[PDB]
Amino acid sequence: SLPDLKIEKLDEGVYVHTSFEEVNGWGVVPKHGLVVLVNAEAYLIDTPFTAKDTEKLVTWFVERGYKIKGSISSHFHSDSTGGIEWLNSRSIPTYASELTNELLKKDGKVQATNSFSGVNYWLVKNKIEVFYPGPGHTPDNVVVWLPERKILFGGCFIKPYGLGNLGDANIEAWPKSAKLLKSKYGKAKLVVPSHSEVGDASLLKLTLEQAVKGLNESK
Numbered sequence: 001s002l003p004d005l006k007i008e009k010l011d012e013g014v015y016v017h018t019s020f021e022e023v024n025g026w027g028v029v030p031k032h033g034l035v036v037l038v039n040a041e042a043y044l045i046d047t048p049f050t051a052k053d054t055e056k057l058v059t060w061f062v063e064r065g066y067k068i069k070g071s072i073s074s075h076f077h078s079d080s081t082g083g084i085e086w087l088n089s090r091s092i093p094t095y096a097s098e099l100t101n102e103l104l105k106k107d108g109k110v111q112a113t114n115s116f117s118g119v120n121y122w123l124v125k126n127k128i129e130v131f132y133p134g135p136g137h138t139p140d141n142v143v144v145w146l147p148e149r150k151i152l153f154g155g156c157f158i159k160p161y162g163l164g165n166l167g168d169a170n171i172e173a174w175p176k177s178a179k180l181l182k183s184k185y186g187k188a189k190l191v192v193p194s195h196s197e198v199g200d201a202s203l204l205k206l207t208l209e210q211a212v213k214g215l216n217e218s219k
């Protein structure tokens with residue numbers, strides 16, 4: 001059996017949700033995302049793999065008096081977007097980048113209700129910022145920055161030990177994207193990857209090194 005959904009406090013106003021899935025060819029994969037609290041409102045940063053876990057996650061917060069204001073998905077793969085269909089059915093606003101919605105469409109998946117283009121997008125003014133560093137893990141990957149906490153949710157772009165599945169990756173672009181990310185959020189207090197433990201700004205350097213190595217190995 002898979003472990004259950006976990007929800008744990010990370011910082012004042014920020015929780016990490018971890019879900020688990022058996023992935024063909026990769027084994028059991030943990031997935032971290034965040035929940036961010038602003039007053040009595042909650043924002044989901046990435047959805048769990050399944051509608052079932054998305055509902056569990058939402059219910060956990062609703063029980064504690066929060067209203068679910070929005071969800072943002074970091075990239076098109078299912079481990080960031082699997083709960084979109086369910087959230088949309090409940091009229092909970094969902095957000096994704098234009099590129100993400102286009103990839104969802106092409107992949108036969110329900111799109112986020114709201115989208116944005118460009119490099120910086122403020123989901124919540126002064127509190128939650130979405131940044132696009134360029135193609136890497138996927139063409140559309142974005143990160144989420146909480147300036148009040150200096151916490152960067154790097155999602156599936158942050159790959160400190162190895163790049164993982166390159167099926168949708170842009171190996172030529174990843175190093176330039178990773179350098180841009182590291183120069184932008186080099187002062188991060190915490191960096192939260194999708195598939196490995198929370199770390200400090202060093203995870204940005206390691207991702208860059210891995211991207212550079214991967215490109216070299218590809219040539």
Ligand SMILES: C[C@H](CS)C(=O)N1CCC[C@@H]1C(=O)O
Pocket residue numbers: 023026029077079156163164165195
């Ligand atoms: C299925 C997920 C979607 S990012 C995936 O591609 N993974 C998870 C573990 C191996 C590989 C990765 O880590 O990039």
Ligand SMILES: [Zn+2]
Pocket residue numbers: 075077137138156
């Ligand atoms: Zn992915």
Ligand SMILES: [Zn+2]
Pocket residue numbers: 077079155156194195
């Ligand atoms: Zn992932």
